[PDB]
Amino acid sequence: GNNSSNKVRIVEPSFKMTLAELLDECKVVPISVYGDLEVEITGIEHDSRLVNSGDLFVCCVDGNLCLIEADKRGAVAVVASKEIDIEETLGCKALVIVEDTNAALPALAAAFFRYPTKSMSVIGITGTHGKTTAAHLIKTMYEAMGLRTGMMSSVAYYVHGDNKLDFPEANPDAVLVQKLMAKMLHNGTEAVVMEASSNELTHTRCEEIDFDIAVFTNLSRDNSHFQGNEEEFRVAQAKLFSRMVDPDRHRKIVNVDDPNAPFFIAQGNPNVPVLTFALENKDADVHPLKFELSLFETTVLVNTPQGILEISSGLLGRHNIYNILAAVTVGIAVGAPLEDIVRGIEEVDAVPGRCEVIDEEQAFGVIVDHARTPDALSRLLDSVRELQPRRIITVIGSCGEKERGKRPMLAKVATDKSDVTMLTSDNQGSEDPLDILDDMLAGIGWTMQDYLKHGENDYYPPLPNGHRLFLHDIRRVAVRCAVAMGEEGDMVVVAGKGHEAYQVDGDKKEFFDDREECREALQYVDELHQAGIDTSEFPWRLPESH
Amino acid sequence: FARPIAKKPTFLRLRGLFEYEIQSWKYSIPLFFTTQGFDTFRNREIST
């Protein structure tokens, strides 16, 4: 528009407000208040290592050494848990000590930030699969329809346009949430796409958030250690729908394809209207009457409430079709036109580090995913089965810590669904890479003792299903040969980490991107055409030796 | 040009033992050799 390259100004209003107004706005009974509330509030924080002069510094902990740190800094409020007197050890400013800093922390932040979620289209999205992809597509669609959009996830933070505020740890407290919320509110943005993470809704956060649209894309059973019973999983995840209070400015997007869609709806204000997406279940408001998925082509004739529309794109993935269905249903909730929905859908061609298709003049689809669980590789393998290519190669990473129970079943599904498998050393920050490669096969039926007795005689084995064995450690050569395998129209997965733009091997840290190396290898395919005999299993790349 | 068979895998095709006495090798193998970096191929193995 104006510049499109210079950074947009950090237009943050420095809030001016006093402690008595704070107590009146959010009436919390004091237990350890002294003196008088003669203090001007200048900022807000929770952690002493980020506490500056004049912030809230609220977090539940007893006998903390951070009290002295905040006293040195000069925080306006210094309240962890402990009854502490004034003018001797905490003479920096006044005290407003509350019973539970976590309970009133969203309340105090909203009162200080003037409750910015009321003046925004704050959308929380629940579910298990495709959360980040759904957030990306929804934010692109919302930005397309003539209005700015924000982003509140655990992987990235898009303030507006294309600048990315550095993504912090999985979930900080509500102080950072409301700080970035103020940035959205006063930086030209008028909406935000918030991921309703389990830790977010568990840690007393959604009490002081006004949700405009609540979306339920897909359901799956994971992290069952935290959700000890399926009832807790179905109720805690239903807190997103329970926050709904106004069935005239708020809408419900539900997945009747999943079994518990009415169950999710019934957990609070069913009057808020239900708009449903489902592909296999044609009894939905938005449904792709025609569905076609290929390795490089994808066609969807979808009968939205507006009408029947054709969507053609190379963004593969059946769950990606489900996600696009959820996005168009969300657009229907706000009454957005189909043309703007298509513009938003096509506004993204490669979501960062997930399902990132690379086509640098080649017929083998390079694709990566987060792949922090074996079920992610299993799901991508089922998608590949649904999108049957000629030859299947999947480069398998490793496991960081001592979670040795995943790689057996991971290698099982890989070798069962891939003609040729491949392994590498992606994340092994715990032990030696050789031991990590040894652990890769630990539960399914083949023993690596043969890897001991190679002697130029075991290089040509056909594992259980006649498929091919695989072993390597040098990540660069591993991915180079993985891209170098692709002959014509085969499957070339080099996944395992996703958007992780580095590489760790026990005690190392350097720059390493999988996508960049993949496109570089696609470029050197021209040099690769000069040779390439003895291609199938092992070894590779060296001619004039037969 | 010796080929050390060792712990590291041998993704490079075949092994070879040694062959460097022909005057043609000054510019014959460079077309087949390297082709992807210098240290990432020559220094991995085939030491002299």
Side-chain angles (χ1 to χ4, degrees):
Chain A
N2 42 6
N3 40 17
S4 312
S5 298
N6 200 1
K7 201 182 300 294
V8 195
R9 320 186 306 112
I10 301 144
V11 188
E12 206 282 331
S14 197
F15 311 106
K16 287 278 141 277
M17 201 215 87
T18 192
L19 203 56
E21 191 177 351
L22 198 49
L23 188 134
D24 281 322
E25 271 174 357
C26 286
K27 176 63 211 152
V28 315
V29 279
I31 38 163
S32 315
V33 73
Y34 327 83
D36 62 340
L37 321 173
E38 183 198 338
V39 48
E40 214 285 329
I41 320 295
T42 83
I44 168 165
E45 200 53 33
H46 77 308
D47 188 66
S48 83
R49 297 284 83 214
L50 292 183
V51 166
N52 82 312
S53 300
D55 49 53
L56 292 202
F57 183 55
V58 284
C59 61
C60 42
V61 57
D62 178 70
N64 199 352
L65 74 171
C66 293
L67 263 47
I68 316 110
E69 281 147 35
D71 175 65
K72 263 109 76 171
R73 299 284 201 164
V76 280
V78 68
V79 178
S81 76
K82 164 72 191 303
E83 158 205 9
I84 48 187
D85 211 300
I86 80 164
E87 196 141 25
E88 180 41 57
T89 56
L90 286 300
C92 66
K93 219 46 166 148
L95 305 318
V96 85
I97 293 207
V98 308
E99 268 165 81
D100 184 17
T101 41
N102 200 11
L105 191 155
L108 288 186
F112 189 45
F113 285 92
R114 314 292 191 244
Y115 194 31
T117 66
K118 252 182 58 177
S119 325
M120 225 70 160
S121 173
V122 180
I123 282 165
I125 180 149
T126 194
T128 289
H129 273 90
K131 300 177 293 180
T132 57
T133 313
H136 287 83
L137 295 156
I138 286 161
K139 75 190 180 191
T140 51
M141 211 286 288
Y142 213 136
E143 195 176 14
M145 71 155 278
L147 188 73
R148 276 195 143 104
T149 326
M151 161 66 21
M152 201 156 258
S153 70
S154 61
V155 194
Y157 274 94
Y158 266 133
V159 186
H160 39 52
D162 286 313
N163 54 21
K164 196 259 288 172
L165 193 172
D166 170 76
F167 64 114
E169 55 269 22
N171 222 356
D173 87 312
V175 160
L176 288 87
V177 166
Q178 297 304 320
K179 266 176 167 197
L180 195 140
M181 191 30 216
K183 303 297 196 301
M184 306 329 220
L185 186 78
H186 213 243
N187 268 20
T189 321
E190 268 307 310
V192 82
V193 186
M194 212 265 264
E195 160 151 358
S197 179
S198 59
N199 171 275
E200 217 284 341
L201 263 75
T202 313
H203 272 194
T204 63
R205 296 287 177 268
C206 56
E207 210 69 31
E208 264 64 52
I209 314 175
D210 197 12
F211 276 160
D212 266 9
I213 289 192
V215 199
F216 166 62
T217 56
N218 291 116
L219 186 131
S220 285
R221 190 240 188 179
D222 198 53
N223 277 126
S224 294
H225 307 155
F226 199 104
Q227 311 287 327
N229 263 324
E230 85 265 10
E231 191 60 67
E232 201 192 3
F233 179 51
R234 297 160 186 262
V235 163
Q237 290 271 19
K239 224 188 176 51
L240 188 82
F241 262 15
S242 82
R243 189 44 58 190
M244 282 295 178
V245 73
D246 224 357
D248 61 346
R249 301 164 65 260
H250 310 147
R251 331 290 277 191
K252 297 273 208 26
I253 307 299
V254 188
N255 181 230
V256 292
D257 206 323
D258 272 324
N260 52 358
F263 187 74
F264 265 51
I265 290 160
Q267 311 275 294
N269 240 143
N271 297 104
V272 185
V274 175
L275 303 163
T276 80
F277 92 106
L279 170 52
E280 68 104 32
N281 157 9
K282 213 51 71 182
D283 322 68
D285 210 2
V286 202
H287 53 101
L289 261 186
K290 199 182 173 192
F291 160 82
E292 277 83 34
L293 192 32
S294 301
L295 78 151
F296 290 149
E297 206 269 335
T298 314
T299 290
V300 164
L301 274 307
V302 47
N303 187 4
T304 79
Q306 316 198 16
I308 303 165
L309 186 47
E310 203 177 40
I311 298 170
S312 175
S313 290
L315 311 165
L316 43 56
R318 325 227 156 192
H319 301 89
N320 223 319
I321 324 281
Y322 294 10
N323 184 338
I324 301 284
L325 257 179
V328 47
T329 324
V330 164
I332 295 298
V334 282
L338 273 187
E339 322 313 302
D340 281 345
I341 291 185
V342 158
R343 285 171 61 222
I345 289 314
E346 306 282 349
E347 217 163 17
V348 49
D349 280 327
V351 277
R354 269 177 99 151
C355 214
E356 196 147 40
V357 49
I358 306 189
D359 198 272
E360 290 289 285
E361 204 266 309
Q362 97 262 0
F364 32 92
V366 170
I367 170 177
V368 76
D369 42 35
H370 55 300
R372 208 58 266 188
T373 168
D375 274 312
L377 304 320
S378 190
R379 191 188 67 101
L380 167 141
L381 269 286
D382 326 293
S383 64
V384 168
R385 305 281 78 65
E386 304 279 317
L387 276 70
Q388 37 182 355
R390 285 263 308 263
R391 183 171 198 77
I392 329 295
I393 199 185
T394 77
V395 179
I396 288 304
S398 34
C399 187
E401 317 281 3
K402 206 62 85 187
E403 297 80 33
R404 223 175 59 96
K406 46 173 294 295
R407 63 210 84 172
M409 192 214 68
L410 170 148
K412 199 38 150 186
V413 293
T415 44
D416 289 336
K417 282 176 266 285
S418 316
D419 304 358
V420 47
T421 321
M422 261 315 317
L423 56 82
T424 179
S425 96
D426 276 354
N427 287 315
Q428 66 270 40
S430 45
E431 39 182 331
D432 188 72
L434 268 73
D435 292 342
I436 277 295
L437 298 191
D438 220 24
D439 317 321
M440 302 219 58
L441 194 37
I444 57 178
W446 196 83
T447 325
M448 261 166 217
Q449 279 284 304
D450 298 329
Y451 182 36
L452 203 163
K453 49 187 90 70
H454 259 304
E456 207 63 41
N457 293 128
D458 190 45
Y459 295 4
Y460 337 92
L463 260 239
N465 32 217
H467 295 197
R468 324 300 209 172
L469 258 194
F470 53 115
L471 60 105
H472 203 66
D473 169 291
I474 295 287
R475 184 135 202 282
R476 178 47 170 73
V477 189
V479 288
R480 174 54 141 72
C481 296
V483 187
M485 182 276 268
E487 295 270 73
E488 186 40 66
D490 41 358
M491 143 51 64
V492 70
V493 156
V494 309
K497 58 203 207 330
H499 214 229
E500 220 61 85
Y502 62 75
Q503 167 61 22
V504 76
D505 170 20
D507 200 31
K508 188 64 80 169
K509 208 166 77 70
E510 83 284 357
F511 73 79
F512 219 115
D513 190 5
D514 194 21
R515 309 281 92 184
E516 301 285 70
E517 179 49 47
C518 280
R519 44 151 287 175
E520 288 148 38
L522 292 161
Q523 181 260 317
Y524 333 115
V525 167
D526 319 332
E527 280 94 24
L528 289 175
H529 273 145
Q530 313 151 355
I533 309 104
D534 208 74
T535 301
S536 269
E537 319 96 325
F538 269 98
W540 190 227
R541 213 214 179 263
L542 256 68
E544 71 262 354
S545 196
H546 195 87
Chain B
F1 273 139
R3 184 263 187 281
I5 278 177
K7 304 275 202 206
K8 213 169 188 179
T10 165
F11 249 98
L12 307 189
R13 231 180 79 208
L14 257 288
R15 65 189 152 251
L17 327 168
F18 65 104
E19 253 327 284
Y20 171 62
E21 215 157 0
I22 296 178
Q23 204 174 347
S24 84
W25 266 316
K26 303 308 165 88
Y27 47 84
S28 86
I29 40 187
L31 322 165
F32 314 81
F33 274 7
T34 71
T35 298
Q36 175 43 62
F38 288 138
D39 189 281
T40 167
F41 154 78
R42 176 157 249 184
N43 280 32
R44 292 296 168 257
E45 80 100 30
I46 307 282
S47 180
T48 175

